[PDB]
């Protein structure tokens, strides 16, 4: 174990990502927009920076960036939720009501669905929450374990007052999504037809089903269906602690979701993010007509270090979700536009040359709170995970940026493109030399990314102390990770352009913004 100093640990706290004042935070819960405020709830341990004693924290903002702490929303305080309050989804009804479904756990570890709602709908801040006196409302059916019956989705409307929700589970090694019908969100009936199932995935947690447009650049309200509408089906794959999605079609008549590509079905195809990114939940934003995705990123250091610093885990910056209309076969994820309100000043680097085996310093001053947009051109089998990262030199890769780096590269975090031979483009993030400390993650993360005719290779990086978020080709591929440098901290952190290819030189242009604090604080 590394002997972390107070100064090394203090630096790890983020400037502009959501995290509570102290302690453990994890899964997103019941995100909504209501009466001028974006609302976010989250799993929270009041006692220690480890998983447990599960309650719901609550925060609000005008803009998805400038968060304000509110009082705890739900506590573990009844027999049916004494071992924790978990994974909630809100359904907002036409009459103005907000119905919050959650999973409560008993002393025996038995999981059951329960209902909560606001004490006062006239309160824009929704400070106080009440539990339905008829709780608990739903226990596991005969085919599903009562200790693994969790995570109701946001509802979608059918007809004649009937709504549907999804609950993920498994049968043996096959992941499944069950559907229940309700008219009041107090009593539920299980449908005979599953929404969908995929063999050899294991348990599906946190199932999400939502419409996306094939024509516009707006998100769609959750109950929208029709001819120019496709549906994303998403599941958190428990055995992998990773989130997978697929694009398909949902039929209200049959209650079946069918994949456009069975080879890329839920759990065996595309991910929202190829890094550390879990329990994602979307909601519809009526203010700017967007669909927004929340997800948490666990610490990648030791539990010993977490207990010493007194906190664990952060949320990514929320992202929009749209269908990629250029390909038709993936989604695009991109940080919400309000993140740009943090941009202080910019510096531009135009047509910088990097020959084979070169490293080029980029003088930006402090390099710990940044938004970076870069484009690369090559002047006139492989797998990120099993590769040697930036050290594995090929004819047409690797090339990209070094973030969280020292002057002499004693520590560095490469984010790069690698073109392999029909050519494939890989986009990867290399943790192998991110820190001199031995008890942190040292993996290479990534995947292929589609690069279309005439397109430059493009990446955007958000750098914020111990979290880095990366985006290729406008969000066709994303990679999120955590870094814990021992030396590349405060003024000692630097930024570089690099090209470790053997048979290509590159030309790059960059624009880099220093980023302000989000000033996350208590509501007054
Ligand atoms: C690129 O290389 C990586 C590393 O080898 C591949 O990921 C690995 O895939 C294995 C399956 O081929 C996984 O094995 C499983 O291990 C767990 C226990 O850890 C078992 O419970 C389970 O039954 C499997 O045996 C392995 O976990 C996984 N390693 C990592 C670090 O993720 C990768 O394969 C691709 O990703 C994985 C996650 C699966 O989705 C595969 O279907 C998929 O091919 C390689 N990529 C490619 C394109 O081949
Ligand atoms: C560009 O590619 C070269 C060639 O692979 C990289 O240099 C190589 O860097 C690796 C990793 O630092 C060296 O491997 C060794 O790893 C062990 C740990 O297992 C360590 O104890 C050694 O001290 C050493 O670091 C390797 O020797 C070195 N190879 C050569 C020929 O110099 C280079 O780092 C890459 N550039 C960038 C910016 O990443
Ligand atoms: C999960 O795996 C179990 C073990 O293979 C399945 O039970 C087996 O089902 C066979 C018929 O498909 C039957 O010959 C075996 O005797 C039986 N084995 C045991 C130990 O029960 C199970 O299949 C479900 O449960 C059985 C009893 C039948 O009702 C099937 O129709 C069910 O599918 C597997 N579960 C699923 C959902 O596939
Ligand atoms: C949840 O709260 C309870 C009661 O307040 C605490 O006892 C738990 O603390 C942990 O468990 C006890 C028995 C002891 O081992 C202590 O060292 C632990 O911190 C607390 N649990 C968690 C996971 O924070």
XYZ file of C-alpha atoms and ligand atoms in Angstrom:
674
model
C 0.000 0.000 0.000
C 1.152 3.537 -0.857
C 1.696 5.998 2.052
C -0.692 8.735 0.803
C -0.146 12.258 2.156
C -2.951 14.667 3.107
C -1.988 16.871 0.136
C -2.141 13.960 -2.340
C -5.555 12.890 -0.996
C -7.081 16.390 -0.771
C -6.256 17.008 -4.454
C -8.479 14.077 -5.535
C -11.770 15.901 -4.763
C -13.354 17.259 -7.958
C -13.978 20.927 -8.796
C -17.076 20.554 -11.007
C -18.522 17.006 -10.726
C -21.352 16.110 -8.374
C -20.318 14.502 -5.094
C -21.655 14.933 -1.533
C -19.782 16.804 1.215
C -18.426 13.462 2.508
C -18.905 9.657 2.572
C -20.110 7.030 0.038
C -22.376 7.844 -2.927
C -23.388 5.411 -5.696
C -26.437 4.656 -7.923
C -28.544 7.457 -9.480
C -32.158 7.490 -8.212
C -35.351 9.025 -9.640
C -33.989 11.913 -11.752
C -36.655 14.430 -12.896
C -37.256 18.037 -13.939
C -39.914 19.765 -11.808
C -41.082 23.375 -11.411
C -37.848 24.980 -12.654
C -35.421 22.575 -10.932
C -33.467 19.523 -12.047
C -33.736 16.943 -9.235
C -31.161 14.215 -8.556
C -31.339 11.498 -5.872
C -28.595 8.967 -5.062
C -27.540 6.003 -2.921
C -25.776 7.317 0.188
C -24.095 5.802 3.252
C -24.265 8.389 6.065
C -21.744 6.506 8.241
C -18.714 5.355 6.192
C -17.136 5.784 2.706
C -18.047 2.175 1.802
C -21.267 0.574 0.468
C -24.010 0.107 3.068
C -26.689 1.566 5.356
C -28.417 2.707 2.174
C -30.403 5.965 2.072
C -31.251 8.548 -0.626
C -29.438 11.883 -0.839
C -31.120 14.744 -2.733
C -29.739 17.711 -4.704
C -31.181 20.359 -7.086
C -29.879 22.704 -9.802
C -31.189 25.179 -12.364
C -28.819 23.890 -15.044
C -27.568 20.309 -14.311
C -24.189 21.781 -13.174
C -24.571 24.151 -10.200
C -25.806 21.676 -7.570
C -27.181 22.559 -4.134
C -27.422 20.052 -1.259
C -30.882 19.370 0.221
C -31.905 17.270 3.249
C -31.942 13.449 3.009
C -35.007 12.308 1.022
C -35.540 8.690 2.171
C -34.164 6.776 5.165
C -34.057 3.080 6.085
C -36.725 3.317 8.794
C -39.480 0.697 8.291
C -39.358 -3.116 8.660
C -39.694 -3.511 4.868
C -36.699 -1.256 4.109
C -34.578 -1.526 7.302
C -31.609 -3.008 5.396
C -31.728 -0.171 2.853
C -33.657 1.966 0.367
C -32.569 1.210 -3.231
C -32.772 2.055 -6.951
C -35.821 4.230 -7.560
C -37.575 5.488 -10.679
C -40.156 8.265 -10.914
C -43.227 8.238 -13.134
C -44.870 11.641 -13.619
C -48.623 11.417 -14.276
C -50.840 13.802 -16.353
C -52.712 14.976 -13.215
C -49.445 16.352 -11.762
C -48.678 13.483 -9.380
C -45.163 12.046 -8.966
C -44.975 8.313 -8.168
C -41.590 7.094 -6.932
C -41.085 3.323 -7.007
C -38.177 1.879 -5.009
C -36.761 -1.415 -3.734
C -36.686 -1.949 0.035
C -34.688 -4.706 1.748
C -35.706 -6.548 4.944
C -33.481 -7.885 7.756
C -33.629 -11.245 5.908
C -32.218 -9.623 2.713
C -35.618 -10.033 0.984
C -36.248 -7.421 -1.730
C -39.728 -5.951 -2.353
C -41.165 -3.028 -4.334
C -42.523 -0.022 -2.393
C -43.982 3.416 -3.219
C -43.097 6.938 -2.082
C -44.395 10.379 -3.116
C -43.927 14.081 -2.225
C -45.526 15.394 0.970
C -46.280 18.661 -0.881
C -46.444 18.920 -4.697
C -46.577 22.736 -4.375
C -42.950 22.651 -3.142
C -40.658 23.055 -6.193
C -37.802 21.691 -4.054
C -39.716 18.509 -3.084
C -37.956 18.482 0.312
C -40.223 16.028 2.176
C -41.121 12.523 0.968
C -43.834 10.185 2.332
C -44.052 6.377 2.167
C -47.278 4.727 0.955
C -49.125 3.221 3.981
C -49.816 0.075 1.917
C -46.075 -0.713 1.550
C -44.587 -3.129 0.691
C -46.581 -3.498 -2.542
C -44.937 -6.276 -4.610
C -43.028 -9.483 -3.816
C -41.103 -11.772 -6.200
C -42.997 -14.143 -8.549
C -42.362 -17.931 -8.409
C -39.669 -17.873 -11.135
C -37.435 -15.199 -9.532
C -35.391 -15.228 -6.281
C -36.868 -13.021 -3.509
C -33.316 -11.873 -2.682
C -32.816 -10.713 -6.299
C -35.996 -8.802 -7.219
C -35.061 -5.170 -7.760
C -34.933 -1.921 -9.787
C -38.315 -0.871 -11.287
C -38.069 1.413 -14.347
C -39.880 4.644 -15.203
C -43.320 3.763 -16.601
C -44.696 4.105 -20.131
C -48.373 4.654 -20.976
C -50.510 2.123 -22.885
C -54.231 3.042 -22.993
C -57.392 3.183 -20.834
C -55.428 4.258 -17.726
C -52.909 1.387 -17.866
C -49.147 1.954 -17.443
C -46.275 -0.536 -17.829
C -42.960 -0.803 -15.933
C -39.922 -3.049 -16.422
C -38.119 -5.103 -13.760
C -34.906 -6.881 -14.777
C -33.948 -10.326 -13.458
C -32.601 -13.657 -14.762
C -33.624 -17.238 -15.445
C -30.486 -19.333 -14.802
C -27.775 -17.634 -16.932
C -30.272 -15.825 -19.213
C -30.875 -12.111 -18.519
C -34.550 -11.072 -18.661
C -36.834 -8.037 -18.416
C -40.288 -8.639 -16.914
C -43.173 -6.214 -17.450
C -45.878 -5.314 -14.910
C -49.098 -3.373 -15.524
C -50.767 -0.882 -13.164
C -53.453 1.803 -13.087
C -52.540 3.385 -9.722
C -48.870 2.496 -9.002
C -50.104 0.719 -5.847
C -51.094 -2.688 -7.311
C -49.175 -4.521 -10.073
C -49.913 -7.438 -12.430
C -47.166 -9.499 -14.115
C -47.480 -9.952 -17.885
C -46.933 -13.392 -19.463
C -44.720 -12.043 -22.276
C -41.229 -10.872 -21.295
C -40.030 -7.574 -22.794
C -36.902 -9.408 -24.002
C -34.287 -11.974 -22.912
C -30.637 -12.691 -23.850
C -28.774 -15.955 -23.043
C -25.453 -16.064 -21.126
C -25.561 -12.500 -19.709
C -26.554 -13.169 -16.095
C -28.675 -10.752 -14.030
C -30.024 -7.565 -15.629
C -30.127 -4.663 -13.150
C -31.463 -1.126 -13.640
C -33.378 -1.831 -16.902
C -34.222 1.253 -19.041
C -36.607 1.347 -22.052
C -36.994 4.618 -23.987
C -37.896 6.040 -27.433
C -35.402 7.864 -29.692
C -36.136 9.859 -32.866
C -34.913 8.777 -36.310
C -35.400 12.275 -37.769
C -34.975 15.116 -35.257
C -32.234 16.272 -32.897
C -34.496 16.365 -29.813
C -35.073 13.758 -27.107
C -38.528 12.178 -26.794
C -40.967 11.875 -23.895
C -40.982 8.323 -22.471
C -44.476 7.321 -23.732
C -43.912 8.443 -27.361
C -44.379 5.725 -30.017
C -44.967 5.607 -33.790
C -43.414 5.181 -37.283
C -40.298 7.406 -36.972
C -39.548 6.053 -33.473
C -37.028 3.429 -32.362
C -36.456 2.196 -28.788
C -33.261 1.732 -26.802
C -33.218 -1.185 -24.348
C -30.517 -0.866 -21.654
C -29.386 -3.106 -18.780
C -26.743 -2.930 -16.070
C -24.906 -6.255 -16.317
C -24.299 -7.191 -12.659
C -21.629 -9.845 -13.291
C -19.522 -7.302 -15.254
C -20.460 -4.096 -13.383
C -20.886 -2.535 -16.853
C -23.818 -0.953 -18.749
C -24.912 -2.263 -22.175
C -27.554 -0.993 -24.627
C -29.066 -1.993 -27.982
C -31.197 -0.242 -30.623
C -34.490 -1.827 -31.662
C -38.268 -1.570 -31.893
C -40.941 -1.897 -29.188
C -44.496 -2.948 -30.029
C -47.242 -1.954 -27.565
C -49.617 -4.608 -28.943
C -47.298 -7.551 -28.291
C -45.177 -5.995 -25.479
C -42.035 -7.265 -27.263
C -38.788 -5.361 -27.822
C -36.836 -6.717 -30.832
C -33.154 -5.864 -31.616
C -32.183 -4.329 -34.978
C -29.010 -6.440 -34.761
C -29.254 -9.732 -32.784
C -25.422 -10.013 -32.766
C -25.306 -6.765 -30.760
C -28.204 -7.604 -28.396
C -28.441 -6.331 -24.787
C -25.342 -7.453 -22.856
C -23.373 -8.709 -25.881
C -23.062 -5.505 -27.952
C -22.454 -1.793 -27.415
C -21.836 0.092 -24.156
C -22.610 3.725 -23.279
C -19.035 3.974 -21.941
C -16.055 1.601 -22.202
C -14.576 2.726 -18.855
C -15.888 2.829 -15.273
C -19.556 3.779 -15.582
C -22.531 2.066 -13.932
C -26.245 1.985 -12.972
C -27.177 4.585 -15.596
C -30.679 6.099 -15.668
C -32.211 8.509 -18.201
C -34.987 11.093 -17.906
C -36.786 13.445 -20.288
C -36.001 17.172 -19.938
C -39.003 19.229 -21.139
C -37.108 22.554 -20.821
C -34.712 21.959 -23.742
C -36.426 18.797 -25.077
C -33.501 16.447 -24.360
C -33.001 12.959 -22.957
C -30.297 13.076 -20.275
C -28.285 10.152 -18.807
C -26.867 9.934 -15.264
C -24.209 7.392 -14.192
C -21.727 6.909 -11.339
C -17.982 6.221 -11.434
C -16.511 4.218 -8.540
C -13.137 4.920 -6.938
C -10.325 2.889 -8.523
C -7.989 3.180 -5.513
C -7.807 1.180 -2.247
C -10.554 1.048 0.410
C -7.829 2.042 2.911
C -7.278 5.291 0.965
C -11.048 5.907 0.746
C -11.403 5.602 4.541
C -8.425 7.942 5.046
C -9.800 10.692 2.763
C -13.339 10.166 4.117
C -15.325 9.923 0.857
C -15.901 7.645 -2.166
C -17.224 7.934 -5.756
C -18.513 10.673 -8.108
C -21.143 11.135 -10.839
C -20.075 11.865 -14.419
C -21.256 15.139 -15.946
C -24.767 14.325 -17.247
C -24.889 13.522 -20.986
C -27.494 13.914 -23.727
C -28.552 10.779 -25.639
C -29.478 10.865 -29.350
C -29.553 8.282 -32.139
C -26.503 8.631 -34.412
C -28.238 9.447 -37.696
C -24.969 9.253 -39.668
C -24.658 5.504 -38.949
C -28.107 4.507 -37.653
C -26.451 1.809 -35.524
C -25.208 3.505 -32.311
C -26.212 6.354 -29.982
C -24.317 9.628 -29.417
C -23.536 10.678 -25.825
C -22.294 14.239 -25.168
C -21.877 16.345 -22.004
C -24.873 18.638 -21.381
C -24.274 22.071 -22.965
C -24.395 23.827 -19.573
C -20.929 22.395 -18.760
C -19.650 25.080 -21.148
C -20.728 27.727 -18.566
C -17.643 26.668 -16.549
C -15.215 27.624 -19.353
C -12.944 30.481 -18.192
C -10.501 31.163 -21.045
C -9.118 29.330 -24.076
C -5.768 28.675 -25.719
C -5.471 27.404 -29.294
C -2.778 25.248 -30.892
C -3.015 25.233 -34.695
C -1.583 22.548 -37.009
C 0.964 21.185 -34.517
C 3.271 18.611 -36.109
C 4.124 15.349 -34.352
C 6.488 12.990 -36.187
C 6.923 9.271 -35.524
C 7.994 8.644 -31.916
C 7.595 12.264 -30.772
C 6.269 14.058 -27.672
C 5.234 17.741 -27.819
C 4.544 19.835 -24.680
C 1.376 21.960 -24.629
C 1.867 24.995 -22.368
C -1.574 25.707 -20.877
C -0.543 26.632 -17.321
C -2.398 24.548 -14.729
C -3.688 21.270 -16.211
C -6.099 19.796 -13.639
C -9.427 21.471 -14.530
C -9.778 21.404 -18.349
C -12.086 21.020 -21.355
C -10.039 19.876 -24.385
C -11.193 19.571 -28.007
C -8.677 18.105 -30.461
C -8.598 16.934 -34.084
C -5.938 14.722 -35.709
C -4.981 13.836 -39.292
C -2.469 11.313 -40.642
C -0.156 13.150 -43.073
C -0.049 12.124 -46.748
C -5.799 -8.690 -33.927
C -5.507 -5.444 -31.946
C -7.591 -4.989 -28.781
C -7.175 -2.021 -26.367
C -7.591 -4.270 -23.307
C -4.833 -6.770 -24.211
C -2.522 -4.138 -25.742
C 0.578 -2.568 -24.191
C -1.185 0.816 -24.333
C 0.875 3.822 -25.461
C 3.980 1.589 -25.348
C 2.743 -0.806 -28.063
C 3.950 0.851 -31.271
C 2.309 0.084 -34.628
C 2.552 1.450 -38.177
C -0.510 3.723 -37.794
C -0.718 4.197 -33.996
C -0.841 5.010 -31.145
C -1.259 8.817 -31.215
C -3.168 11.294 -29.035
C -2.775 13.176 -25.761
C -1.032 12.639 -22.432
C -2.997 14.042 -19.471
C -2.128 14.014 -15.730
C 1.541 13.899 -16.739
C 4.746 15.023 -15.025
C 7.443 17.024 -16.874
C 9.624 13.926 -17.364
C 6.683 11.526 -17.901
C 7.324 9.616 -14.639
C 3.515 9.517 -14.523
C 1.185 9.861 -17.553
C -2.353 8.984 -18.723
C -2.556 8.509 -22.538
C -5.837 8.863 -24.424
C -5.276 7.727 -28.011
C -6.301 6.519 -31.461
C -4.801 3.375 -33.025
C -5.507 2.489 -36.671
C -5.248 -1.253 -37.382
C -5.192 -3.415 -40.521
C -10.394 -2.672 -44.399
C -9.031 -0.537 -41.548
C -10.333 -0.292 -37.976
C -9.945 2.703 -35.665
C -9.476 2.029 -31.938
C -9.974 4.637 -29.188
C -8.325 3.784 -25.845
C -7.392 5.110 -22.392
C -4.189 3.747 -20.775
C -3.995 3.617 -16.930
C -0.820 1.478 -16.782
C 1.518 4.343 -15.778
C -1.039 6.819 -14.350
C 0.459 6.601 -10.855
C 3.608 5.372 -9.103
C 1.315 3.935 -6.397
C 0.835 0.174 -6.798
C -2.645 -0.188 -5.235
C -4.662 1.559 -7.988
C -6.165 0.392 -11.327
C -3.597 -0.202 -14.114
C -5.840 -1.333 -17.010
C -6.104 -0.241 -20.664
C -9.732 0.538 -21.585
C -11.480 1.089 -24.937
C -13.039 -0.220 -28.154
C -13.346 0.465 -31.875
C -15.133 3.639 -33.027
C -16.749 4.333 -36.424
C -14.849 6.907 -38.499
C -16.745 7.930 -41.630
C -15.466 9.137 -44.999
C -13.971 12.642 -44.814
C -13.906 12.762 -40.997
C -10.866 13.771 -38.966
C -10.061 11.792 -35.803
C -11.606 13.885 -33.010
C -11.551 13.658 -29.210
C -12.934 15.732 -26.358
C -11.561 15.375 -22.812
C -12.984 16.669 -19.552
C -10.218 16.702 -16.934
C -11.213 17.268 -13.288
C -8.664 16.188 -10.678
C -9.211 12.424 -10.059
C -11.730 11.932 -12.916
C -11.162 11.981 -16.698
C -13.998 11.681 -19.260
C -13.216 11.093 -22.960
C -15.319 11.203 -26.171
C -14.462 10.104 -29.729
C -16.140 11.214 -32.989
C -18.671 13.420 -31.182
C -19.645 10.752 -28.651
C -19.782 7.547 -30.731
C -17.417 6.064 -28.143
C -16.871 7.283 -24.575
C -14.326 6.242 -21.914
C -14.422 7.363 -18.255
C -11.686 6.597 -15.708
C -10.152 7.628 -12.381
C -6.529 8.670 -11.839
C -4.558 8.921 -8.576
C -1.173 10.502 -9.387
C 1.463 10.834 -6.656
C 3.467 13.529 -8.465
C 1.318 14.914 -11.320
C -0.801 17.037 -8.961
C -1.373 20.772 -8.403
C 1.052 22.858 -10.544
C 3.124 19.771 -11.428
C 0.479 18.239 -13.728
C 1.132 18.784 -17.461
C -0.368 18.154 -20.936
C 1.332 16.682 -24.044
C 0.583 15.747 -27.652
C 2.201 12.404 -28.611
C 2.716 10.154 -31.633
C 4.165 6.686 -30.985
C 3.444 5.309 -34.477
C 6.391 4.032 -36.531
C 5.102 4.785 -40.041
C 2.966 7.918 -39.774
C 3.342 11.572 -38.853
C 0.328 13.495 -37.584
C -0.993 17.058 -37.689
C -3.265 18.177 -34.848
C -5.295 21.246 -33.864
C -6.494 21.841 -30.292
C -8.584 24.268 -28.258
C -8.197 24.078 -24.461
C -10.322 25.828 -21.806
C -9.494 26.266 -18.114
C -12.559 25.228 -16.082
C -14.148 26.926 -13.034
C -15.594 25.331 -9.894
C -19.296 24.406 -9.937
C -19.431 25.781 -6.342
C -21.441 22.824 -5.028
C -22.795 23.811 -1.589
C -25.834 23.586 0.720
C -29.133 25.137 -0.413
C -30.054 28.312 1.489
C -10.473 -7.849 -25.857
O -9.795 -8.493 -24.791
C -10.488 -8.546 -23.555
C -9.567 -9.197 -22.522
O -9.318 -10.541 -22.875
C -11.822 -9.289 -23.711
O -12.591 -9.191 -22.528
C -12.705 -10.452 -21.833
O -13.636 -11.333 -22.430
C -13.751 -12.596 -21.795
C -14.699 -13.461 -22.618
O -14.091 -13.742 -23.861
C -14.223 -12.450 -20.344
O -14.171 -13.727 -19.731
C -15.160 -13.881 -18.692
O -14.555 -13.872 -17.411
C -15.461 -13.905 -16.320
C -14.676 -13.804 -15.011
O -13.851 -12.658 -15.021
C -16.303 -15.184 -16.374
O -17.301 -15.149 -15.376
C -16.967 -15.348 -17.744
O -17.610 -16.603 -17.823
C -15.966 -15.167 -18.892
O -15.086 -16.271 -18.968
C -13.336 -11.448 -19.594
O -13.920 -11.098 -18.360
C -13.112 -10.163 -20.388
N -12.113 -9.340 -19.727
C -12.316 -8.057 -19.414
C -11.177 -7.354 -18.737
O -13.362 -7.447 -19.652
C -12.628 -8.692 -24.867
O -13.776 -9.490 -25.084
C -14.960 -8.669 -25.239
O -15.427 -8.039 -24.032
C -15.967 -8.943 -23.047
C -16.322 -8.169 -21.780
C -17.161 -9.704 -23.628
O -18.235 -8.797 -23.919
C -16.745 -10.432 -24.906
O -17.895 -11.015 -25.527
C -16.074 -9.484 -25.900
O -15.550 -10.230 -27.006
C -11.780 -8.588 -26.138
N -12.521 -7.921 -27.195
C -12.857 -8.531 -28.332
C -13.626 -7.713 -29.327
O -12.570 -9.702 -28.586
C 6.446 4.789 -26.943
O 6.769 3.411 -27.041
C 7.969 3.054 -26.360
C 8.372 1.628 -26.748
O 7.492 0.659 -26.216
C 7.806 3.281 -24.847
O 9.003 2.988 -24.136
C 8.856 1.814 -23.299
O 8.158 2.094 -22.102
C 7.875 0.949 -21.316
C 6.943 1.369 -20.182
O 7.503 2.466 -19.494
C 9.175 0.302 -20.810
O 8.869 -0.925 -20.160
C 9.373 -1.155 -18.810
O 8.341 -1.545 -17.910
C 8.791 -2.053 -16.658
C 7.579 -2.413 -15.803
O 7.061 -3.664 -16.204
C 9.675 -1.027 -15.942
O 10.216 -1.573 -14.759
C 10.799 -0.540 -16.861
O 11.526 0.498 -16.240
C 10.220 -0.041 -18.182
O 9.424 1.101 -17.932
C 10.134 0.042 -21.978
O 11.423 -0.236 -21.470
C 10.228 1.206 -22.973
N 10.882 0.737 -24.188
C 11.781 1.450 -24.868
C 12.340 0.794 -26.098
O 12.156 2.579 -24.546
C 7.414 4.744 -24.610
O 7.152 4.944 -23.237
C 6.202 5.142 -25.467
N 5.865 6.555 -25.338
C 4.871 7.006 -24.556
C 4.655 8.490 -24.553
O 4.156 6.279 -23.860
C -33.073 -23.459 -15.521
O -32.351 -24.680 -15.536
C -33.000 -25.796 -14.947
C -32.005 -26.959 -14.915
O -31.699 -27.359 -16.236
C -34.288 -26.106 -15.720
O -35.010 -27.168 -15.113
C -35.037 -28.345 -15.948
O -36.000 -28.252 -16.983
C -35.979 -29.342 -17.892
C -36.972 -29.052 -19.013
O -36.518 -27.934 -19.747
C -36.287 -30.663 -17.172
O -36.074 -31.759 -18.041
C -35.389 -30.843 -15.951
O -35.861 -31.926 -15.176
C -35.337 -29.579 -15.088
N -34.355 -29.771 -14.041
C -34.534 -29.366 -12.779
C -33.414 -29.662 -11.831
O -35.546 -28.777 -12.385
C -35.158 -24.843 -15.784
O -36.305 -25.069 -16.578
C -37.508 -24.581 -15.945
O -37.975 -25.396 -14.852
C -38.416 -26.709 -15.245
C -38.783 -27.519 -14.000
C -39.561 -26.612 -16.259
O -40.730 -26.042 -15.658
C -39.140 -25.756 -17.459
O -40.251 -25.570 -18.344
C -38.603 -24.398 -16.998
O -38.081 -23.664 -18.117
C -34.358 -23.653 -16.328
N -35.203 -22.471 -16.323
C -35.593 -21.855 -17.442
C -36.492 -20.665 -17.273
O -35.262 -22.215 -18.573
C -24.053 1.250 9.548
O -24.526 1.779 10.774
C -24.394 0.873 11.854
C -25.174 1.392 13.062
O -25.007 2.786 13.198
C -22.903 0.696 12.138
O -22.699 -0.199 13.216
C -22.163 0.190 10.895
O -20.777 0.311 11.151
C -20.042 -0.877 10.767
O -20.453 -2.102 11.403
C -20.131 -2.206 12.807
C -20.739 -3.478 13.397
C -18.615 -2.135 12.990
O -17.985 -3.242 12.330
C -18.096 -0.823 12.403
O -16.666 -0.801 12.455
C -18.542 -0.629 10.952
O -18.220 0.705 10.537
C -22.553 0.947 9.611
N -22.177 0.170 8.440
C -21.547 0.671 7.377
C -21.249 -0.302 6.275
O -21.210 1.850 7.267
